[PDB]
């Protein structure tokens, strides 16, 4: 908590021109009202919980989708951008960009709240896709998102969108379990990895993720040993657990609390509050 936040600020103040890569997961959007989807109940996933799946990851599993598209359709209705406000942590990413110390944010989330907080498209890698377009799970043919978004408004949701070439189901280009990740993910990580290998020391900060989903969870062990890694998470997970490095910094904090503490350790409160009030 305290000392490791001081050490992060210590690194940033002693490497003022260095940039930071963030790698984030579902924990940074829980405060927004988006739960980590395996545990349903009151809130966003309420009406998903009623007619519920044979396994927790069924809603984002392409095999289950094939067998029954209605649970995902019901979930997607709640997840289109515009339903939620970005969290304090999302706005911290915008503050790092304003200060010219944001190299990239790699996100496992599909809520696009990094974008909605104002992070530039160039600096966001949406590793698990987004609602920006649709695709056939058979052809791979691409479709505009409106083909799908319009069905989401119907009462009830029935006659799911199908491919006009091969007749298989069409869905948003979100990466389900069982599907390939977008080319931009591997290609940009390959470039940022080379940049991490090139005396202003960069920094990688991993926030709010269990590091249980691959290949995204491979990224922390691929950070060079000469580059300091930070994990801000409720528990020590992933490569930080299995293969601790002496310079690793662990912050067992909620992500909004971490944002608040780091902002005022850096002395950036006044800029941060201006961002928060817009």
């Amino acid at each position: 908590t305290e000392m490791s936040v001081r050490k992060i600020a210590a690194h940033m103040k002693s490497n003022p021109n260095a940039k930071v890569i963030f790698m984030v997961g579902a924990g940074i959007s829980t405060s927004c009202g988006i739960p980590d989807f395996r545990s349903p109940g009151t809130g966003l996933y309420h009406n998903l919980a009623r007619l519920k799946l044979p396994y927790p990851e069924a809603v984002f599993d392409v095999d289950f989708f094939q067998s029954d598209p209605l649970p995902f359709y019901t979930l997607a209705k709640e997840l289109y951008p515009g339903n939620f406000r970005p969290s304090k942590f999302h706005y911290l990413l915008k503050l790092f960009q304003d200060k010219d110390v944001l190299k990239r944010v790699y996100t496992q989330n599909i809520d696009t709240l990094e974008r909605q907080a104002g992070v530039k498209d160039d600096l966001i890698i949406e590793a698990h896709g987004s609602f920006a377009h649709c695709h056939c799970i058979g052809c791979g043919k691409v479709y505009p998102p409106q083909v799908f978004k319009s069905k989401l408004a119907e009462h009830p949701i029935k006659d799911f969108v199908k491919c006009d070439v091969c007749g298989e189901l069409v869905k948003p280009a979100i990466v389900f379990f069982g599907e390939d990740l977008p080319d931009s993910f591997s290609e940009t990580w390959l470039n940022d990895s080379e940049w991490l290998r090139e005396p202003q020391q960069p920094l990688v900060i991993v926030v709010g993720t269990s590091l249980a989903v691959y290949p995204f969870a491979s990224l922390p062990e691929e950070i060079p040993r000469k580059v300091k890694r930070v994990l801000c998470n409720l528990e020590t997970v992933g490569d930080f657990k299995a293969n601790k490095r002496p310079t690793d910094l662990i912050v067992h904090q909620y992500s909004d609390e971490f944002a608040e503490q780091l902002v005022e350790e850096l002395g950036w409160q006044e800029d941060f509050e201006k961002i928060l009030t817009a």
Binding site: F176, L181, Y214
Partner: peptide, 9 residues
């Protein structure tokens, strides 16, 4: 290349 999963290495 890389496919999404809960398993891995």
């Amino acid at each position: 290349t890389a496919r999404k999963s809960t398993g891995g290495k």
